[PDB]
Write a protein that binds this ligand. Structure first.
Ligand SMILES: CN[C@@H]1[C@@H](O)[C@@H](O[C@@H]2[C@@H](O)[C@H](O[C@H]3OC(CN)=CC[C@H]3N)[C@@H](NSCCNC(=O)CCNC(=O)[C@H](O)C(C)(C)COP(=O)(O)OP(=O)(O)OC[C@H]3O[C@@H](n4cnc5c(N)ncnc54)[C@H](O)[C@@H]3OP(=O)(O)O)C[C@H]2N)OC[C@]1(C)O
Ligand SMILES: CN[C@@H]1[C@@H](O)[C@@H](O[C@@H]2[C@@H](O)[C@H](O[C@H]3OC(CN)=CC[C@H]3N)[C@@H](NSCCNC(=O)CCNC(=O)[C@H](O)C(C)(C)COP(=O)(O)OP(=O)(O)OC[C@H]3O[C@@H](n4cnc5c(N)ncnc54)[C@H](O)[C@@H]3OP(=O)(O)O)C[C@H]2N)OC[C@]1(C)O
Ligand SMILES: [Cl-]
Ligand SMILES: [Cl-]
Ligand SMILES: [Cl-]
Lengths: 260, 259
């Protein structure tokens, strides 16, 4: 059994292509990393040493309210509003977003379903002004990731969990984009108010594609020799440029709607 | 399915005996409460509604360093020191202590192995000046729970988990208290320092008694008609006064050492 250390994981990260000042959104399957001396906090600590105090690490937090509780009117009274300071991350995204969110100094954005946890030099910029309606468009941490030419790291995670590609769905012009409208409780200056949202669908694909077609795009982007693979600990990992994968994915999407 | 709510949980705790101004050390098996609307945070939220802002809810945090790693001289330099604001709770204690530790406004004491997470009106008093050596004695959140006549809620948790009683062992005079001595890294204003610790054993019972011997004590304590049993959500729960079970566990231990 190979043990990882904050020093060891730092080197694996520089090996994958991570440098000073980088902003990186990390999706992670942490137990694929193997044994770590000081726990998965060594991952975040190693990252921050590599990228420096001006860099920023992000995690997709979201939140925990199931759709049927939300859509069931007996439950409505007892559902706490979304609190970017106390609402815990959705557990389907793994411990990684909660690891970030619960580290002191971290910040979290306002759009509940698209909410992002961030820590580092630009965590305030990344979490600020998160558009509530259409939280995966230009006024979101994902959009600012592209503007800052950040990166996406799949830390042993399945490739179809690349949330950044939902931003490509928003930008990409193709016909019959499913529009989603739901109502969720948030706080308005301290008090629970129920509110109507609208966004492009992120729970299921455009009609033709499969539930995991994100993975095909990522593998097809890695096929052009952009990006870079490598081992972080013992987890197979991928590091992609945010702007390039998003430009790649929107054409791929716009190319597919022109068809049939 | 009976779903519990912040209002529903508030009742069940009022029925068990929680009141305004109470300090309560909570040990939990959150899975046995069943389905809750807003998750387990409704439990804490309902608690502080019942005790009010002057009350305090506590949890046994500890921390995650494995002994076998601590004493490996090759692992020595990659082990992060204990940071009371960053070190995550031990996972053997369930989600409850880190539920509290990661709630905004909560606090955590300095004694690593005996660390406690606290939130409420007197969380700063309970967490302050936790003795590094013998962190289960009078200079600990456990001792101040007795001084403030607090309570212990066993929220579906097995009975042997009442860490408050490891503090009775510290107080109780009896033969052959196995003393433990180890070296652990601790953060000293932001810099890792290794340091030798000293305490009465808490991971193993005094050799005569069973590992699970805390359960029998509380059962025995229950049978004197003090403390109260009741249902929190769907979890069978017990709420006892801190000072009474401590004083009752000391007589009990000193009695057994006379033999
Ligand atoms: C209201 N919210 C929702 C809406 O926003 C909307 O949601 C969608 C969502 O439905 C979409 O999801 C759809 O599309 C996709 C396509 N992929 C799939 C799901 C669909 N429903 C979503 N698209 S994206 C999903 C983004 N996901 C991620 O980023 C997560 C990536 N990671 C993984 O996938 C891994 O494979 C997981 C599943 C996490 C497995 O991880 P793992 O098993 O390897 O282990 P962990 O990572 O969790 O950690 C294990 C390890 O960690 C350490 N650890 C835990 N706790 C510790 C403590 N306390 N202390 C120390 N260490 C700790 C341990 O070592 C542990 O190991 P051990 O326990 O010892 O074994 C887009 C969204 N918009 O619509 C739905 C909703 C609900 O409305
Ligand atoms: C340096 N450290 C150590 C030393 O200090 C020293 O340690 C000793 C220690 O060894 C002693 O332990 C020994 O003596 C005893 C005495 N019986 C037993 C163990 C011995 N090794 C210790 N004596 S005290 C132990 C104190 N224990 C507790 O306080 C914990 C009580 N709880 C329980 O017992 C439950 O039964 C557990 C075990 C927690 C299981 O409960 P559960 O599985 O049913 O449910 P959970 O509570 O975990 O919650 C899960 C549930 O909650 C919701 N949830 C979780 N996460 C959520 C998130 N992120 N979001 C929303 N909701 C969440 C979910 O519903 C979840 O359920 P689900 O996942 O959906 O299924 C004294 C010490 N000093 O020596 C050793 C060391 C290491 O040196
Ligand atoms: Cl450091
Ligand atoms: Cl209403
Ligand atoms: Cl992969």
């Amino acid at each position: 059994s190979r043990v990882s250390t904050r020093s060891s994981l730092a080197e694996d990260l520089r090996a994958i292509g991570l440098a000073d000042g980088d902003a990186v959104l990390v999706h992670a399957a942490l137990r694929k990393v193997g044994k770590i001396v000081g726990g998965p906090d060594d991952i975040l600590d190693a990252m921050r040493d590599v990228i420096g105090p001006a860099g920023t690490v992000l995690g997709y937090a979201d939140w925990q309210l199931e759709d049927e509780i939300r859509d069931d009117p007996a439950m409505r009274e007892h559902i706490p509003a979304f609190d970017p300071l106390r609402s815990r991350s959705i557990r389907d995204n793994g411990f990684w977003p909660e690891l970030i969110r619960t580290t002191p100094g971290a910040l979290r954005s306002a759009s509940p379903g698209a909410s992002m946890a961030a820590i580092g030099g630009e965590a305030e910029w990344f979490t600020a002004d998160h558009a509530l309606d259409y939280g995966y468009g230009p006024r979101s941490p994902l959009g600012k990731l592209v503007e800052a030419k950040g990166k996406v790291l799949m830390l042993g995670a399945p490739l179809d969990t690349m949330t950044l590609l939902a931003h490509a769905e928003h930008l990409a012009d193709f016909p019959n984009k499913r529009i989603l409208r739901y109502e969720a409780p948030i706080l308005v200056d301290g008090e629970k108010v129920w509110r109507w949202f609208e966004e492009f669908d992120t729970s299921d694909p455009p009609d033709g594609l499969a539930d995991d077609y994100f993975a095909g795009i990522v593998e097809e982007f890695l096929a052009t020799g952009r990006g870079k693979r490598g081992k972080i600990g013992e987890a197979s990992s991928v590091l992609v440029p945010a702007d390039e994968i998003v430009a790649f994915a929107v054409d791929w999407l716009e190319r597919w709607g022109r068809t049939a």
